[PDB]
């Protein structure tokens, strides 16, 4: 299990390896992870805790899922966050009656009835400001845009929550992302203090892809949600099927449970047949069957698929076409008004002048509905739209815009 | 009021005064004062925000003395086999106790100018770590709160716990909650806790809105540099009579260089600019007969004593060096008066002649160096000039049945103390 993180490269940072491998064998650990309940959904950002707990449940551990309540009510419907999100928390971790069951906590059944007076005493004493401030984080903050003291008070907190999580629950790892390290060491030094007992950190990185952009970060720069209403399973696929080829392993290993072996088979692929993404299209299904099931996977890829020439684009049903043609900028033509390849073309962005629309007509590279257009003046039949409503335009194999009929 | 403490010279910092001067006119404020003592009992060094607050009500407004529980009862790394039983209990006895010595002033009665004493703790005791963090610490900079040079000094090192850097915040809040209770606008204190009042009159103007104002009196220190308020050599001066004594009181006060009486004069007490020049004249004057602080000790021993026992501590200073009769004393002040000196106890069998006690209470350094002494000059025993060497205690020389009083001139005296 220590093994597995390992070679994907998913520890970031750890207590003692050796002493935590030696629990992990000693029986199933309870591993836990916290979250902020007041968003809507999960989203992007948790797929890798989330992923990582999984990792955990499989190899035979307990994960508990620690709603972060306290926050959300300090910060800046807890009880229905949870049902907000099960469905999606079901996807990752299993919920059943027996020992290695998955389980959801709110910090606010200990953080709600303790007084400032507790706070300052039992768990403050135990602070010292100077090693608080000791820290890169803090310490950037504090050089950057200022630290409130309640913002700086958290990770007394978060290390409580841990104190009372071991208490509870008998648990002794706790997982987060690399930048929540000193939140979690915390804790690990107050049980030791207030317990006696020894308990284990390990952060999983950050991912941020080559170019330095941020993972899960959408087209309009928000949030990739795991809600179908708000990502669609499309918005979801096209994201992992545009991870770039710098990337595109290492997501794999990171995010997927394909073995070793798998994932050098893949990187053969993406080294010898580039233009064929092997790598992203697995790495797209299996993080869109993960999250959305396969039924809804199979329509996406086939959409996916007819919308760049790969397929057959008649068969696919309205709803799904819709879906897949909203993400991409699409003209609405109305009565009047283009009508015509070149004016279509400029309408839906495709071509920037009229001018260039000419070119690459020309150049064999404009097709409506993954037929080609030869001709200039080309109109659209009534024949040609898709359930009455939609064309589909691309030039070359890469890029596309819609056209949606309008009365 | 203003210009009372103006010229009498209790201002050491505030907001602006006219403001100030603005809302008192307007009518009576409510003015505070914290205090957050390790004992039970206030000491010396609590007077001159007190008598100041005493100032604020003669001149019609409210005060209120802000017994600072919380501290406390953070304070103490104990752990609940051990802090349980008795923290409330004994939160309860520390309040009274110093309820008790507030009674004398400033006068407590149902009346708008009425005193109330109030322990944080009925706010602070109920305060959730939520309510902390949400409703109060957001109002706070940590890099604010770090410059702080109280803070910026006794952060270096091994540093602060986070509960020592918190209770900021705690006093801070003391300010909001008691303009919320009781419209208070005006809190006092030391020169030194400037810092953390300010600290209140700021998060009162983020919190609530309204502008409340600060004013500092001064830190009381000797002419020749030394401190107020401690003992020749050691600590404090209890108000407290069974932990200092009323004649230590008043001795304390008595002895209050002539540099310093007519300055203390005027903060400790009420005498008008004119009484004060009076005594001022005499003090240049007459050095010698200490009018002064003869003044000061009888002030300041009525105000925390009461009149019976001043009468007392004058009549005994009077009595044990000739000056009066010491059959008239309270056996408590004679007490004191002599535990104060060199007091030789005498166990029954051990040697009772003049000459043994005088050796015993080290009056005389030898058993002839005594004799000597004796002879023209003479030892006193109860202010009764002894003139034969082999004189012996009577039974009915005792005072009260337990204390001679023994002096070689007159000034030089110690006790003996029969078991």
Same mark, same amino acid.
């Given at each position: 299990?220590?093994?597995?993180?390992?070679?994907?490269?998913?520890?970031?940072?750890?207590?003692?390896?050796?002493?935590?491998?030696?629990?992990?064998?000693?029986?199933?650990?309870?591993?836990?992870?916290?979250?902020?309940?007041?968003?809507?959904?999960?989203?992007?950002?948790?797929?890798?805790?989330?992923?990582?707990?999984?990792?955990?449940?499989?190899?035979?551990?307990?994960?508990?899922?620690?709603?972060?309540?306290?926050?959300?009510?300090?910060?800046?419907?807890?009880?229905?966050?949870?049902?907000?999100?099960?469905?999606?928390?079901?996807?990752?971790?299993?919920?059943?009656?027996?020992?290695?069951?998955?389980?959801?906590?709110?910090?606010?059944?200990?953080?709600?009835?303790?007084?400032?007076?507790?706070?300052?005493?039992?768990?403050?004493?135990?602070?010292?400001?100077?090693?608080?401030?000791?820290?890169?984080?803090?310490?950037?903050?504090?050089?950057?845009?200022?630290?409130?003291?309640?913002?700086?008070?958290?990770?007394?907190?978060?290390?409580?929550?841990?104190?009372?999580?071991?208490?509870?629950?008998?648990?002794?790892?706790?997982?987060?992302?690399?930048?929540?390290?000193?939140?979690?060491?915390?804790?690990?030094?107050?049980?030791?203090?207030?317990?006696?007992?020894?308990?284990?950190?390990?952060?999983?990185?950050?991912?941020?892809?080559?170019?330095?952009?941020?993972?899960?970060?959408?087209?309009?720069?928000?949030?990739?949600?795991?809600?179908?209403?708000?990502?669609?399973?499309?918005?979801?696929?096209?994201?992992?099927?545009?991870?770039?080829?710098?990337?595109?392993?290492?997501?794999?290993?990171?995010?997927?449970?394909?073995?070793?072996?798998?994932?050098?088979?893949?990187?053969?692929?993406?080294?010898?047949?580039?233009?064929?993404?092997?790598?992203?299209?697995? &790495?797209?299904?299996?993080?869109? %069957? !993960?999250?959305? =099931?396969?039924?809804?996977? @199979?329509? $996406? /890829?086939?959409?996916?698929?007819?919308?760049?020439?790969?397929?057959?684009?008649?068969?696919?049903?309205?709803?799904?076409?819709?879906?897949?043609?909203?993400?991409?900028?699409?003209?609405?033509?109305?009565?009047?008004?283009?009508?015509?390849?070149?004016?279509?073309?400029?309408?839906?962005?495709?071509?920037?002048?009229?001018?260039?629309?000419?070119?690459?007509?020309?150049?064999?590279?404009?097709?409506?509905?993954?037929?080609?257009?030869?001709?200039?003046?080309?109109?659209?039949?009534?024949?040609?739209? &898709?359930?009455?409503?939609?064309? %589909? !335009?691309?030039? =070359?194999?890469?890029?596309? @815009?819609? $056209? /949606?009929?309008?009365?």
């Amino acid at each position: 299990i220590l093994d597995e993180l390992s070679w994907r490269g998913l520890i970031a940072q750890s207590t003692d390896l050796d002493t935590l491998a030696a629990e992990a064998q000693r029986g199933p650990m309870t591993v836990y992870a916290g979250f902020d309940p007041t968003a809507p959904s999960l989203h992007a950002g948790h797929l890798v805790p989330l992923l990582t707990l999984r990792r955990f449940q499989r190899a035979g551990h307990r994960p508990i899922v620690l709603a972060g309540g306290a926050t959300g009510m300090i910060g800046d419907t807890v009880a229905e966050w949870t049902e907000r999100i099960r469905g999606q928390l079901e996807r990752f971790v299993d919920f059943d009656d027996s020992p290695m069951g998955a389980i959801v906590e709110n910090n606010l059944e200990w953080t709600g009835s303790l007084s400032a007076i507790e706070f300052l005493r039992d768990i403050g004493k135990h602070f010292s400001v100077n090693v608080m401030l000791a820290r890169d984080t803090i310490r950037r903050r504090l050089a950057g845009e200022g630290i409130s003291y309640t913002e700086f008070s958290y990770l007394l907190l978060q290390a409580n929550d841990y104190v009372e999580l071991h208490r509870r629950h008998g648990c002794t790892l706790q997982i987060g992302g690399a930048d929540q390290w000193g939140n979690i060491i915390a804790g690990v030094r107050l049980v030791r203090q207030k317990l006696g007992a020894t308990v284990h950190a390990l952060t999983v990185p950050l991912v941020t892809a080559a170019d330095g952009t941020k993972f899960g970060k959408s087209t309009g720069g928000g949030s990739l949600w795991l809600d179908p209403q708000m990502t669609s399973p499309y918005a979801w696929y096209q994201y992992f099927v545009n991870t770039a080829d710098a990337d595109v392993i290492r997501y794999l290993r990171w995010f997927t449970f394909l073995s070793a072996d798998e994932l050098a088979e893949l990187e053969q692929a993406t080294a010898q047949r580039p233009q064929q993404r092997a790598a992203q299209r697995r &790495l797209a299904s299996e993080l869109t %069957v !993960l999250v959305h =099931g396969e039924a809804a996977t @199979a329509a $996406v /890829e086939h959409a996916s698929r007819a919308l760049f020439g790969r397929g057959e684009l008649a068969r696919l049903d309205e709803a799904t076409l819709a879906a897949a043609l909203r993400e991409t900028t699409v003209a609405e033509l109305k009565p009047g008004s283009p009508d015509g390849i070149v004016d279509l073309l400029v309408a839906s962005g495709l071509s920037a002048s009229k001018g260039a629309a000419r070119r690459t007509i020309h150049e064999g590279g404009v097709s409506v509905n993954n037929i080609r257009v030869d001709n200039e003046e080309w109109v659209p039949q009534s024949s040609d739209f &898709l359930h009455g409503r939609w064309l %589909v !335009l691309r030039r =070359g194999k890469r890029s596309i @815009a819609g $056209v /949606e009929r309008i009365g």
